[PDB]
Paper text:
Potyviral CP plays a role in virtually every step of the viral infection cycle, from transmission of the virion by aphids, virus assembly and disassembly, regulation of genome amplification, protein translation, to cell-to-cell and long-distance movement. CP consists of a highly conserved globular core flanked by two large extended regions with a high frequency of structural disorder. Here, we show that we can control the shape, size, RNA encapsidation ability, symmetry, stability and surface functionalization of nanoparticles through structure-based design of CP from potato virus Y (PVY).
Interestingly, we detected only two different architectures of filaments. 65% of them had the stacked-ring architecture (VLPΔC40:r) and 35% had left-handed helical symmetry and encapsidated RNA (VLPΔC40:h+RNA). VLPΔC40:r and VLPΔC40:h+RNA filaments are long flexible and hollow nanotubes with an inner dimeter of 4.1 nm and 3.7 nm, respectively.
Residue numbers in the entry:
A (entry chain Ab): 41 to 221
B (entry chain Ac): 77 to 221
C (entry chain Ar): 41 to 76
């Protein structure tokens, strides 16, 4: 009785689900299957829906693979400032120089399954990588902020309707979206 | 406590909900497990009450693969939540493994403003509050649910 | 068993109408005939 007694740690065999004696899962793989948080979320559309929403818009405008990118570059900047739920009728605008050029919104909002927000979320990372660049020159704030009274200056990078709150969001901002959304 | 609760479906209902889905996909006993592995991870992040129409996704590499939701939600008696609860214990045993590498949080938390870091293990719609729940978390579900 | 299983898309052979073994239409043209 010279050895102090150490409490034994009972082992709670987790209840692995089964159907008829065999196991349902194959943990052998479960411990290796590791996706990314965004790519299985619903805040983004599957790469199928996005592939459709890109081919269909590439068709309605009838521009061409070589130049359609430059158009999408505009759609982001437009969405950032205004939002991602406009009237199906109407025109979004992009500019060369100062000659505003309009495009019809119908082919975009219509072919966006289930909604434009999701589809535009595919540019979320690039969106913040664009606002950061913009603010460097001068103080810029997504309008989404100007209507919600945001003047952090640091939260401007994450102020637009189609930011996907992933897991790597500085929490100084995650609060903003839920409060507004 | 779990095996007589209603938050889990009887082993009959679950046995049906597994055979029926094994049929609709027509995959095979050998590989259906790997699919169910995806359904959990999908349910964890999104929930367990999606539109009967639509597709849940699982990935090999980065080529998202879609499956139809209809055969799952339909054959789940009385609801998907219950059926998915059979993976509750494995679910937490999966989140714990995930957080080790980096900070991960079920989306169920991100929408409910959860940033405990320790409660992430128990943040998903289909956790069965058994009797062995650390009470630091039992409060979360009732407040949200 | 390292490859995720992809569901096969069964192919619903539309029932092209026929009379006595031969086909009634001539899709060869149907896919080009386009009126207003």
């Amino acid at each position: 009785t010279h050895t102090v007694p150490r409490i034994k740690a009972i082992t709670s065999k987790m209840r692995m689900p089964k159907s008829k004696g065999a196991t349902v899962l194959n943990l052998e793989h479960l411990l290796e299957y590791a996706p990314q948080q965004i790519d299985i979320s619903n805040t983004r559309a599957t790469q199928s829906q996005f592939d459709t929403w890109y081919e269909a818009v590439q068709l309605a405008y009838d521009i061409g693979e070589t130049e359609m990118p430059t158009v999408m570059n505009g759609l982001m900047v437009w969405c950032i400032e205004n939002g991602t739920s406009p009237n199906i009728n109407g025109v979004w605008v992009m500019m060369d120089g100062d000659e505003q050029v309009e495009y019809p919104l119908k082919p975009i909002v219509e072919n966006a399954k289930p909604t434009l927000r999701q589809i535009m979320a595919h540019f979320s990372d690039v969106a913040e990588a664009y606002i950061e660049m913009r603010n460097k020159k001068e103080p810029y704030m997504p309008r989404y902020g100007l209507v919600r009274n945001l003047r952090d200056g640091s939260l401007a990078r994450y102020a637009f309707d189609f930011y996907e709150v992933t897991s790597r969001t500085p929490v100084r901002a995650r609060e903003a979206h839920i409060q507004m959304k």
